[PDB]
mmCIF file of C-alpha atoms in Angstrom:
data_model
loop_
_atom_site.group_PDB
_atom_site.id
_atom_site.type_symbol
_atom_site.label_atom_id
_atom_site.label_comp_id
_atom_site.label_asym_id
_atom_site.label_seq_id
_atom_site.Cartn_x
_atom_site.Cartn_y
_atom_site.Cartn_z
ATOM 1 C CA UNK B 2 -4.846 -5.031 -1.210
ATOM 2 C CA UNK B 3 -2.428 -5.087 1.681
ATOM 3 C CA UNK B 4 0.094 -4.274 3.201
ATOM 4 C CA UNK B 5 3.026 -4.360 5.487
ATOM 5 C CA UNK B 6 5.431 -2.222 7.397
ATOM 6 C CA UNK B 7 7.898 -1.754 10.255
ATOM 7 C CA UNK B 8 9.591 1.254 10.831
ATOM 8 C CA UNK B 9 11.889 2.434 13.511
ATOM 9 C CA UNK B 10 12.704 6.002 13.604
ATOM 10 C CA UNK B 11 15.382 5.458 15.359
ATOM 11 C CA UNK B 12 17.672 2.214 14.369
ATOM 12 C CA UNK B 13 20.311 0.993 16.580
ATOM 13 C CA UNK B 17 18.658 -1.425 11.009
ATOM 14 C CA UNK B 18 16.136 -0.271 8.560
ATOM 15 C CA UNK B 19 13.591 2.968 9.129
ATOM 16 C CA UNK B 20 11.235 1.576 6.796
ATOM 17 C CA UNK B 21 10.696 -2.201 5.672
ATOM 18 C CA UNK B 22 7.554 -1.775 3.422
ATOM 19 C CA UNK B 23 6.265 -4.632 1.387
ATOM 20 C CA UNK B 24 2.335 -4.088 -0.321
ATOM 21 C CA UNK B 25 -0.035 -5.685 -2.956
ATOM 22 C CA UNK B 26 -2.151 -3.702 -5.034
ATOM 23 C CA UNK B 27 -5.094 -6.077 -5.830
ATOM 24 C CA UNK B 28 -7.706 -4.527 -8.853
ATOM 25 C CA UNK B 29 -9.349 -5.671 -11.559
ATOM 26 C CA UNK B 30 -7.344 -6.358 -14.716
ATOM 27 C CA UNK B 31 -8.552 -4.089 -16.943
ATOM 28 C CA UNK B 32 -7.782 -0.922 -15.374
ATOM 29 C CA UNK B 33 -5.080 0.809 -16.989
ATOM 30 C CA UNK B 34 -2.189 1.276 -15.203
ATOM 31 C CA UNK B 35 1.762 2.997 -15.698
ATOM 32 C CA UNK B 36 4.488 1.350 -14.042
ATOM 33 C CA UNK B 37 6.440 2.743 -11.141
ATOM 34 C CA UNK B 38 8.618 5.625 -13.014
ATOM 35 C CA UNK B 39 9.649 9.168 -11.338
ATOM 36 C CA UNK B 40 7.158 12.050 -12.011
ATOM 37 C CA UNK B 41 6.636 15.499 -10.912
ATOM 38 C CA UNK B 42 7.886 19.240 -11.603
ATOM 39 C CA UNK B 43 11.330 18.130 -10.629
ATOM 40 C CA UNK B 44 11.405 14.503 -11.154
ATOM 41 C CA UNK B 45 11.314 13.289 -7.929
ATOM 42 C CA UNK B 46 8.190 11.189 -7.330
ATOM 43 C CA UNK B 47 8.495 7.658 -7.699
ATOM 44 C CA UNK B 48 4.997 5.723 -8.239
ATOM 45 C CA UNK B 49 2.830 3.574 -10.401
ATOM 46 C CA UNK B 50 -0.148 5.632 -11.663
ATOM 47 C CA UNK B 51 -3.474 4.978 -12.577
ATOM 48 C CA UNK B 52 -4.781 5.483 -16.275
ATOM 49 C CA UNK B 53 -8.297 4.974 -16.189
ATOM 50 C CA UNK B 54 -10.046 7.520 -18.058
ATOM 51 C CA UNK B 55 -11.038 10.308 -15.937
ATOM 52 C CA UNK B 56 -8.866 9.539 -12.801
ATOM 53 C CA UNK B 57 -5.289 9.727 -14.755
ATOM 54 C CA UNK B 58 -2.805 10.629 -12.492
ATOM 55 C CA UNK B 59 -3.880 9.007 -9.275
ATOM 56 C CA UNK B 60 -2.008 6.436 -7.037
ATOM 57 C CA UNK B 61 -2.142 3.970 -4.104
ATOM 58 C CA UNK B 62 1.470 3.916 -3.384
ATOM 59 C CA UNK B 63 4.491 6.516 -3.533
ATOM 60 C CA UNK B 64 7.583 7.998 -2.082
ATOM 61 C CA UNK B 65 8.829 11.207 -3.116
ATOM 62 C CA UNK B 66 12.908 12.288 -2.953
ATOM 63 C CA UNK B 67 12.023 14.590 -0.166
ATOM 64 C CA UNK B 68 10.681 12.343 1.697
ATOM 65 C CA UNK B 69 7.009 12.477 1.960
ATOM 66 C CA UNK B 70 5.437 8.693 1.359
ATOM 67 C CA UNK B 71 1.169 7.264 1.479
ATOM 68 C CA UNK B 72 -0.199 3.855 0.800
ATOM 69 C CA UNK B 73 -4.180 3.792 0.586
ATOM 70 C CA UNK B 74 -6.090 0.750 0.475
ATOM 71 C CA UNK B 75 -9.957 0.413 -0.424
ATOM 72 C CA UNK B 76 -12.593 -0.343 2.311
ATOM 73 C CA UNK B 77 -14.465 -3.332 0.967
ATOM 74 C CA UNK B 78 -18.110 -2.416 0.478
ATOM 75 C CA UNK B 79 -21.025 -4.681 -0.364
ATOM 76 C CA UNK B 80 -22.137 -1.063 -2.978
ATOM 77 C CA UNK B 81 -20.468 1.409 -3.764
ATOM 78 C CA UNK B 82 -21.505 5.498 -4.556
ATOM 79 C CA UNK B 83 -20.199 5.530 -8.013
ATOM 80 C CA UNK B 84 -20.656 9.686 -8.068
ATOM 81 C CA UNK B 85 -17.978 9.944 -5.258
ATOM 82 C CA UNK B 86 -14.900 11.718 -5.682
ATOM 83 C CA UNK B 87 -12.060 9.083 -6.894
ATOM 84 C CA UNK B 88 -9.742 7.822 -3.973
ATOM 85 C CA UNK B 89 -6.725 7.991 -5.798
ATOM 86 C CA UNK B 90 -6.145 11.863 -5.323
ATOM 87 C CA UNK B 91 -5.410 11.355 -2.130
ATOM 88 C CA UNK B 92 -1.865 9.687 -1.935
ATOM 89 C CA UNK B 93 -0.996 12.522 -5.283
ATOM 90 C CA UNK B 94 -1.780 15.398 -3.186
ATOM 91 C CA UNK B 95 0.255 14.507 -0.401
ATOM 92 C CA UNK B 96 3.159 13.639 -2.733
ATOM 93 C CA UNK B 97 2.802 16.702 -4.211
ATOM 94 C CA UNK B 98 2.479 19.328 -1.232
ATOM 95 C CA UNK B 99 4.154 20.760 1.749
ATOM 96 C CA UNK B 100 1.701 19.885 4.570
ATOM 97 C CA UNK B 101 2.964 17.472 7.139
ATOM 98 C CA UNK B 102 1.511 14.155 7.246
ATOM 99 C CA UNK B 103 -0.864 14.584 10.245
ATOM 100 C CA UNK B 104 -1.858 17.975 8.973
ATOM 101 C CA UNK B 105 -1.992 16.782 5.917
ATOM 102 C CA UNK B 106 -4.853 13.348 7.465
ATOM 103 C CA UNK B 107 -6.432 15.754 9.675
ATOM 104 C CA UNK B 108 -7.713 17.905 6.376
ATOM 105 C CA UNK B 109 -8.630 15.106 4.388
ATOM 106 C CA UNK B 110 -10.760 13.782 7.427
ATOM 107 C CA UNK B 111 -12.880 16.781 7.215
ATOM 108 C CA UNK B 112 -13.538 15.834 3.604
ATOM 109 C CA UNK B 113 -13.803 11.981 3.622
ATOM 110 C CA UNK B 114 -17.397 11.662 3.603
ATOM 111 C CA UNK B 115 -16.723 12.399 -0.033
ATOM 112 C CA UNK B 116 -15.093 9.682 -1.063
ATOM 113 C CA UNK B 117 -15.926 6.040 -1.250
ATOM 114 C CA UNK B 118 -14.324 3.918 1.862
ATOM 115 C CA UNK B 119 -10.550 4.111 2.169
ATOM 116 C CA UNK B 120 -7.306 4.060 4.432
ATOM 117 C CA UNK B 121 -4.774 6.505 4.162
ATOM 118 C CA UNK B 122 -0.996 6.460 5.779
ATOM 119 C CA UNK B 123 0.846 9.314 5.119
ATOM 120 C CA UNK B 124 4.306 9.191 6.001
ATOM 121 C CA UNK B 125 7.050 12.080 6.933
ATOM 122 C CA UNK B 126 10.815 10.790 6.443
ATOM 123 C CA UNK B 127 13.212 13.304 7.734
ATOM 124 C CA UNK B 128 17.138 11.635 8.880
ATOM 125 C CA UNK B 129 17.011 15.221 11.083
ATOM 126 C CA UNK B 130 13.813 15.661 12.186
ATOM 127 C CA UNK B 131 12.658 11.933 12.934
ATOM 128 C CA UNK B 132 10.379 9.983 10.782
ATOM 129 C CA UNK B 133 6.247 10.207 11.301
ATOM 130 C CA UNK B 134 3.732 7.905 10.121
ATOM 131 C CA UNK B 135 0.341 8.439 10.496
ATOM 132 C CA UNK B 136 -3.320 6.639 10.041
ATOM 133 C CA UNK B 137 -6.778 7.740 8.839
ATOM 134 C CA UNK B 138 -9.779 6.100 7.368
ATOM 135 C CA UNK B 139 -12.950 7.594 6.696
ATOM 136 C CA UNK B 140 -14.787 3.973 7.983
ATOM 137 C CA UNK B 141 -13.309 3.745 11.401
ATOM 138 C CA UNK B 142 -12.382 6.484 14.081
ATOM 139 C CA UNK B 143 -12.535 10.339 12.906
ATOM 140 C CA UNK B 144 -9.358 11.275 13.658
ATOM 141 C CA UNK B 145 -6.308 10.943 12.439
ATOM 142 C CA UNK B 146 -3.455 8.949 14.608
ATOM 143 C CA UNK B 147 -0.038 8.885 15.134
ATOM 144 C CA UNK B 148 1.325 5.528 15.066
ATOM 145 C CA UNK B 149 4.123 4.340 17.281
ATOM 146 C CA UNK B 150 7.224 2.651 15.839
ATOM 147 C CA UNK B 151 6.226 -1.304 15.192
ATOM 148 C CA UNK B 152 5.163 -3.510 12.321
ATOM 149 C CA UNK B 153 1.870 -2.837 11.112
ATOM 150 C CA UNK B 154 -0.843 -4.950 8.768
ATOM 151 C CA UNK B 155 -3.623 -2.740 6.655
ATOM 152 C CA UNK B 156 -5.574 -4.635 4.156
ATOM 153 C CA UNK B 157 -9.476 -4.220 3.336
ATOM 154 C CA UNK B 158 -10.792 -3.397 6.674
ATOM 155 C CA UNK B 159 -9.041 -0.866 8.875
ATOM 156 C CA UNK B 160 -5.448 -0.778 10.146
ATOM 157 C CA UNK B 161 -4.690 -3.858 12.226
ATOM 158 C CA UNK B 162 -8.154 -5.512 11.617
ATOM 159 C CA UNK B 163 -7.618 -9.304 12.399
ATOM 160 C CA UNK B 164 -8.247 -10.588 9.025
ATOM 161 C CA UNK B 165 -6.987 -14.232 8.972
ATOM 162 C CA UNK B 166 -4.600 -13.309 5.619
ATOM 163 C CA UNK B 167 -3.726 -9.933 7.602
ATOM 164 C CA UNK B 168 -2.750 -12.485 10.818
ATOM 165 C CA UNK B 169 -1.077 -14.976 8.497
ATOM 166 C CA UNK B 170 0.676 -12.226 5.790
ATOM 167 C CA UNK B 171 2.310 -10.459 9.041
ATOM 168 C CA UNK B 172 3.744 -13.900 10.520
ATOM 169 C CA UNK B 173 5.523 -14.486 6.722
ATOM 170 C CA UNK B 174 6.688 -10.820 6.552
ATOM 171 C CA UNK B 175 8.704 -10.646 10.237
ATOM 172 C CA UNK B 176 9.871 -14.465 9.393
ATOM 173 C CA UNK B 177 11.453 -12.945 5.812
ATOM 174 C CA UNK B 178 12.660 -9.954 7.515
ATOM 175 C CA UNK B 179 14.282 -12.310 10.132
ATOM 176 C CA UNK B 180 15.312 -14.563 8.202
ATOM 177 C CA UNK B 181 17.869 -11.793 6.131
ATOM 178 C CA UNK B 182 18.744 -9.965 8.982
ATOM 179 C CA UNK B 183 22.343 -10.845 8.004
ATOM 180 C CA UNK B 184 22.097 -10.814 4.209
ATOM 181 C CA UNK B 185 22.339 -8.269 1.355
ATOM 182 C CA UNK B 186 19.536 -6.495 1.071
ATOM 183 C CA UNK B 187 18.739 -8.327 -2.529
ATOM 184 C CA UNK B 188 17.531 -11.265 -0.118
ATOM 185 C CA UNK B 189 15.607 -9.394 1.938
ATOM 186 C CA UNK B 190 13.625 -7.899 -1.138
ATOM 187 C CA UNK B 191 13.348 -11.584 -2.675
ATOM 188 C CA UNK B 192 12.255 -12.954 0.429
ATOM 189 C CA UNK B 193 9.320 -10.322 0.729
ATOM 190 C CA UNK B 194 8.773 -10.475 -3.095
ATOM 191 C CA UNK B 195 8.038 -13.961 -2.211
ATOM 192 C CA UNK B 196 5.774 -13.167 0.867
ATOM 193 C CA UNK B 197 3.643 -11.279 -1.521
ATOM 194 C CA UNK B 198 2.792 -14.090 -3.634
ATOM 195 C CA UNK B 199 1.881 -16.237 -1.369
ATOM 196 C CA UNK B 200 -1.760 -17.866 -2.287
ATOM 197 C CA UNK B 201 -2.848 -19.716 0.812
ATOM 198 C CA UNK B 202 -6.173 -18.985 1.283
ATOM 199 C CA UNK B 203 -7.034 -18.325 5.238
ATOM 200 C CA UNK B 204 -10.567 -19.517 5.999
ATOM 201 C CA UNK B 205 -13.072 -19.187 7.515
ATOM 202 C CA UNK B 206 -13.340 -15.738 7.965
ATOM 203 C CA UNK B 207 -16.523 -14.371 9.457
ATOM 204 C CA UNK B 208 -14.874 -10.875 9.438
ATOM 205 C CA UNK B 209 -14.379 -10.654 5.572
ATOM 206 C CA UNK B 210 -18.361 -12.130 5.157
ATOM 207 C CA UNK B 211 -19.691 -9.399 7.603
ATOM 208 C CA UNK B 212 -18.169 -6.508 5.854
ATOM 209 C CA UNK B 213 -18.196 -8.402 1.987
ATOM 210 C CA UNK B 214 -21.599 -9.399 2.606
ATOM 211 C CA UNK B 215 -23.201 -11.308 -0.476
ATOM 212 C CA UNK B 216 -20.444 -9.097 -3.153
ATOM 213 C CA UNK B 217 -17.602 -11.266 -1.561
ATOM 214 C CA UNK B 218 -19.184 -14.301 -1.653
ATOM 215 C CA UNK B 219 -18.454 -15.630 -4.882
ATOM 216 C CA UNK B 220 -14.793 -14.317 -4.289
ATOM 217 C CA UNK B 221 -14.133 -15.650 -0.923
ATOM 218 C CA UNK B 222 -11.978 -18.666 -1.509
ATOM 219 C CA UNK B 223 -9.851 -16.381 -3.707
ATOM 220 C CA UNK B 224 -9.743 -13.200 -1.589
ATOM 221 C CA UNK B 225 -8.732 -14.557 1.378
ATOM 222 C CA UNK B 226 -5.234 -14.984 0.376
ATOM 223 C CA UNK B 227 -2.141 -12.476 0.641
ATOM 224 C CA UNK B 228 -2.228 -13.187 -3.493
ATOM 225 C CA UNK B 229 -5.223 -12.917 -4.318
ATOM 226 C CA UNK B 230 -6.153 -14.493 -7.733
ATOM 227 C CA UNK B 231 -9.819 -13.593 -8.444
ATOM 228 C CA UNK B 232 -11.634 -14.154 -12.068
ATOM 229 C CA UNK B 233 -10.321 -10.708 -13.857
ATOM 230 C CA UNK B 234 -9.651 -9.273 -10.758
ATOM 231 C CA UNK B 235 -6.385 -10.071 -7.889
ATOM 232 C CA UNK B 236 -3.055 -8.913 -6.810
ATOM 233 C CA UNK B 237 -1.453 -6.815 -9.862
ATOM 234 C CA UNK B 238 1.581 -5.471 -8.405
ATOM 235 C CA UNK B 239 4.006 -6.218 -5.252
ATOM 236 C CA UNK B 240 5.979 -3.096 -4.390
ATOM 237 C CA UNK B 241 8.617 -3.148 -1.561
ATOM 238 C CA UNK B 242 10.109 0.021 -0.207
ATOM 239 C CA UNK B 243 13.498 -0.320 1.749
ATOM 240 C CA UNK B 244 14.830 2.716 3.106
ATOM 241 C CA UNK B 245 18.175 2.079 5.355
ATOM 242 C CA UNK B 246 19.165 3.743 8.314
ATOM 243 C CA UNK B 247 21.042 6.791 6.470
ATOM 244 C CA UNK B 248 18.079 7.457 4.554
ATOM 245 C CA UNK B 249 18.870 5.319 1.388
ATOM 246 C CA UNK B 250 16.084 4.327 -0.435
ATOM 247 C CA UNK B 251 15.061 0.959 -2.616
ATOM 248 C CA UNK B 252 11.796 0.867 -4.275
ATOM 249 C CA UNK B 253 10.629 -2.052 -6.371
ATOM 250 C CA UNK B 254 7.701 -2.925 -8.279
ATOM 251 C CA UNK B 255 6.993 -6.216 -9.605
ATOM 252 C CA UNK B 256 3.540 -5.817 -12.254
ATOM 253 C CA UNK B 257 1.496 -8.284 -13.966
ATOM 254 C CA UNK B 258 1.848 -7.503 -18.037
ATOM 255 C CA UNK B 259 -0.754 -7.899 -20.699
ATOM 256 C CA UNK B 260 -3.133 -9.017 -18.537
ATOM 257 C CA UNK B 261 -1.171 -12.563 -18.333
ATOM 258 C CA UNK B 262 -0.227 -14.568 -14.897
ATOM 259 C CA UNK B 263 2.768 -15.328 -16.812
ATOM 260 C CA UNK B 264 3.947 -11.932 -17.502
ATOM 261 C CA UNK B 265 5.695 -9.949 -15.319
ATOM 262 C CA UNK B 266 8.209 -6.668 -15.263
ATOM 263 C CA UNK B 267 10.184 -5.664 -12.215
ATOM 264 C CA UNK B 268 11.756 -2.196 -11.876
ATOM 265 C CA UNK B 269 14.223 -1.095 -8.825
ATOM 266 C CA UNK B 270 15.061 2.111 -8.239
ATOM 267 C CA UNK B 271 17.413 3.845 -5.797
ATOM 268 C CA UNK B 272 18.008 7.013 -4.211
ATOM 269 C CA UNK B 273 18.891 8.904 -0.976
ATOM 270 C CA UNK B 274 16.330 10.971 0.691
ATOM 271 C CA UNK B 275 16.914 14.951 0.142
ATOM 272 C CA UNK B 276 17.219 17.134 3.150
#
């Protein structure tokens, strides 16, 4: 996986310029990005795998409240730990503050298999609030400062090569339609996220991979990453302007074919 985002609580300009791959194996069954909840208004994909139904990695909800997670890559995993994709639901789905909300689920995330967790707090009143936990790196939670930020495999910010390379592309696209309707923006960052350049070497994808990324290294290394039965699924990008309007696409790979795609855009305006 990975993604990028700027935000800027406070634009002179977007809040939120959000652009992420979800990279899995193919077989998992999956729902595309559709609104949920008891009152409609949580917009996400949604995992389907038997068991786990109901989980996420990426979501935005009408009030406001928005996570991303990303797996830690792990040589071996602990296949009796609780499933990671509870985490960004229950945060769509409550009333606890994003750094409340991080500071709990660090108490709890030797439980789960590695992860990274933002959970987000858009208010146009009370100032936006994005925050940072994973249950590899430090132990708690942090409030992150307005700027463009890179999470992929590893923590947030680790200088991965694709990481490096993926965040040079995304402020060049974002630059590029400063002055442009926003339909450019999303294409140019649509086209970020399929970008298949493999960035090698990379001793710190080997160190943490060890011998289960090997065979996948030339593949993984990429922003796309296009892996035998396993690689970048879905590209979702999350606008939301300075008076709180909000795009969300998702573009998804369909019947387990490179050729086959759907794209769904959605927009709303954050509830107070």
């Amino acid at each position: 996986c990975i993604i990028f985002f700027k935000f800027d609580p406070r634009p002179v300009a977007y809040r939120l310029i959000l652009a992420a791959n979800r990279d899995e194996f193919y077989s998992r069954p999956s729902k595309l990005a559709d609104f949920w909840g008891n009152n409609n208004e949580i917009l996400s994909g949604l995992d389907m795998e038997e068991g786990k139904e109901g989980g996420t990695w990426l979501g935005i909800s009408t009030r406001g409240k928005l996570a991303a997670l990303t797996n830690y890559l792990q040589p071996q995993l602990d296949w009796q730990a609780r499933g990671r994709g509870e985490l960004v639901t229950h945060f769509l789905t409550t009333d606890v503050d994003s750094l409340s909300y991080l500071k709990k689920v660090s108490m709890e995330g030797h439980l789960y298999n590695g992860f990274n967790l933002i959970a987000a707090d858009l208010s146009t009143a009370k100032g936006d609030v994005i925050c940072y936990y994973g249950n590899r790196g430090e132990p708690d939670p942090i409030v992150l400062t307005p700027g463009t930020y890179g999470l992929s495999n590893a923590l947030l910010e680790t200088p991965w090569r694709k990481l490096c390379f993926g965040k040079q592309l995304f402020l060049e696209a974002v630059e590029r339609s400063q002055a442009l309707p926003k339909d450019v923006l999303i294409a140019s960052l649509l086209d970020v996220l399929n970008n298949e350049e493999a960035q090698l070497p990379d001793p710190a994808i080997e160190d943490q991979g060890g011998e289960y990324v090997q065979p996948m290294l030339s593949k993984y290394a990429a922003v796309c990453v296009r892996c035998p039965g396993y690689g970048t699924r879905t590209n979702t990008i999350i606008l939301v302007d300075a008076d709180g309007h909000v795009t969300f696409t998702e573009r998804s790979m369909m019947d387990k074919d490179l050729s086959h795609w759907e794209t769904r855009t959605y927009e709303f305006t954050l509830q107070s």
